[PDB]
Design a binder for these strands. Structure first.
Ligand code: DTP
Ligand code: MG
Ligand code: MN
Length: 538
DNA sequence: GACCACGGCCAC
DNA sequence: AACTGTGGCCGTGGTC
């Protein structure tokens, strides 16, 4: 293009280069803008941010987050990544999008600015006539990008000293287990190396191998294999406890305290908006969507996520969300009635599994019932179900048989979804979000049936993800007017931060917004809690 | 140092 | 192990 002087006219597309992927930690190396067949390159990128009224272009949110870090309100606008993502959610990176729609993603701000301009023109053209995708763009994704930027720049408070203390405690317990594993094995080795562990269990000891690994065909040492050997030899039990502790220490307890930001004093994740095949968000650097919650030690870790002094955390989580979505998408009269009566299938399955009254279902039990209910739903095999529940094969077929005959319209919707996917090549959510699934007519059975399971899962998971995104878009401005903050999204859950004297009002309002976001044929029910820490608030 | 594949495992 | 699905991060082992 023709090189013009900074600043650019209003409505220009931005290009920028960061020292590293994380916007809260990145040095803004370069900044440029393109419009009207010209390119503007900024002499000093930080100063030049003040001139922009809007971040418009590829990865707009990332630049908006960095502007918020500097005390500038530079909201993100159009982003060709979002247009490409709605056209085909396999469009996840600028490298691919550029190569697919008319450019090349380089490492220079000016070229990235001119690329953003061209890619928006072409992609906006590809979307002419796709009115449902355009609705999702204007009413969900583009406004959501602004919400995410604020969430990323706000961060979450963490009890650092608490986790440091915990690390030393967990370390001592790890050494006790390690020392005994070595004693039973008769010698020491790297207990973290699954290759070395394989030899010990299956060659040195006489333990039988139950399964092989996918890519390399080694004898597996996964938890499911060890649980099957848990009493065939004691050492296994110690290995399972070792694995749990080292997993939590190396993934959460030790890395997280070192990631507190110096200006904010808080922990900052990234909410990736074009990263999944179903329309879900993802979280990275660090992932705050997989913080432990299941085991007693996991809960000690979750307690480290706390509220600023004078504030409280508010946590909202949809009830049995993808089951309610299934009722609406399938139109099953039997299943609709289950939620109109305020029933809970996870609690029911839990009582069934454990042979105890519903009043005796602890959280750990209901947690296991969810894997069953969603495993069966999305196609688990009878044999595996028998092994997961330690019951004969015949009883497992019957559970799967009962499960689906209770709701006949479900398998009819599954088959309808698959037929539509084979005709058009894609499946879609309630709002029209698409996932292309071409393997539905593959001649290899395993490849075909895998595609099938991915195919009819996406409309359910994706619709639930659509609803949450829409709720976040509606809820955010209401929270600003109350002086509250939106902190995290965990697929079907939101964590907020609110002043203590407005905490109760915020919880009531957020609950209502999330439940009436988009009424379905079944009521959406939301559980909400308030506490000084993330665990207390659920 | 920077990559990567792999097996494994945390959450939804 | 795997006819549940969606993610991201770990250490190991390897290459460059
Ligand atoms: N094991 C799994 N397999 C497949 N999908 C899953 C699995 N676990 C969770 N999901 C999906 C379906 C859930 O509706 C959705 C949100 O998870 P989650 O909130 O834990 O469960 P839930 O909303 O069904 O129950 P709850 O009433 O406890 O909130 O994620
Ligand atoms: Mg949840
Ligand atoms: Mn839920």
């Amino acid at each position: 293009l023709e090189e013009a002087p900074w600043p650019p006219p209003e409505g220009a597309f931005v290009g920028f280069v960061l020292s590293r992927k994380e916007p809260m930690w990145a040095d803004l190396l370069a900044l440029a803008a393109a419009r009207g067949g010209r390119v503007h390159r900024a002499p000093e990128p930080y100063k030049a941010l003040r001139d922009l009224k809007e971040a418009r272009g590829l990865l707009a949110k990332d630049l908006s987050v960095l502007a918020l870090r500097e005390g500038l309100g530079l909201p993100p606008g159009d982003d060709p990544m979002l247009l490409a993502y709605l056209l085909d959610p396999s469009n996840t990176t600028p490298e691919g999008v550029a190569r697919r729609y008319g450019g090349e993603w380089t490492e220079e701000a000016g070229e990235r600015a001119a690329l953003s301009e061209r890619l928006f023109a072409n992609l906006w053209g590809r979307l002419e006539g796709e009115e449902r995708l355009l609705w999702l763009y204007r009413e969900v994704e583009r406004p959501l990008s602004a919400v995410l930027a604020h969430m990323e720049a706000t961060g979450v408070r963490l009890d650092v000293a608490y986790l440091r203390a915990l690390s030393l405690e967990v370390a001592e317990e790890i050494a006790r287990l390690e020392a005994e594993v070595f004693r039973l094995a008769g010698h020491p080795f790297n207990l973290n190396s699954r290759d070395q562990l394989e030899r010990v269990l299956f060659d040195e000891l006489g333990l039988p191998a139950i399964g092989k690994t996918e890519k390399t065909g080694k004898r597996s040492t996964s938890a499911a294999v060890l649980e099957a050997l848990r009493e065939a030899h004691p050492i296994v039990e110690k290995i399972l406890q070792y694995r749990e502790l080292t997993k939590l220490k190396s993934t959460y307890i030790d890395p997280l305290p070192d990631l507190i930001h110096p200006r904010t004093g808080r922990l900052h994740t990234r909410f990736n908006q074009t990263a999944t095949a179903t329309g879900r968000l993802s979280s990275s650097d660090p992932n705050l969507q997989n913080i432990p919650v299941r085991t007693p030690l996991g809960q000690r870790i979750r307690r480290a996520f706390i509220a600023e002094e004078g504030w409280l955390l508010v946590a909202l989580d949809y009830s049995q969300i993808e089951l309610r979505v299934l009722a609406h998408l399938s139109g099953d009269e039997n299943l609709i009635r289950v939620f109109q009566e305020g029933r809970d299938i996870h609690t029911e399955t839990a009582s069934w599994m454990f042979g105890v009254p519903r009043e005796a279902v602890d959280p750990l039990m209901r947690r296991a019932a969810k894997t069953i209910n969603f495993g069966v739903l999305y196609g688990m095999s009878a044999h595996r179900l028998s092994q997961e529940l330690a019951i004969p094969y015949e009883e497992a077929q019957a559970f799967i048989e009962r499960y689906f005959q209770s709701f006949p319209k479900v398998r009819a919707w599954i088959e309808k979804t698959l037929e539509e996917g084979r005709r058009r090549g894609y499946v879609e959510t309630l709002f029209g979000r698409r996932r292309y699934v071409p393997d539905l007519e593959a001649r290899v059975k395993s490849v075909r049936e895998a595609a099938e399971r991915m195919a009819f899962n996406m409309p359910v998971q994706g619709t639930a993800a659509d609803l949450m995104k829409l709720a976040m878009v509606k809820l955010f401005p209401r929270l600003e007017e109350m002086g509250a903050r939106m902190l995290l999204q965990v697929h079907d859950e939101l964590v907020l931060e609110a002043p203590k004297e407005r905490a109760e009002a915020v919880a009531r309002l957020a609950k209502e917004v999330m439940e009436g976001v988009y009424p379905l044929a079944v009521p959406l029910e939301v559980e909400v809690g308030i506490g000084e820490d993330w665990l207390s608030a659920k």
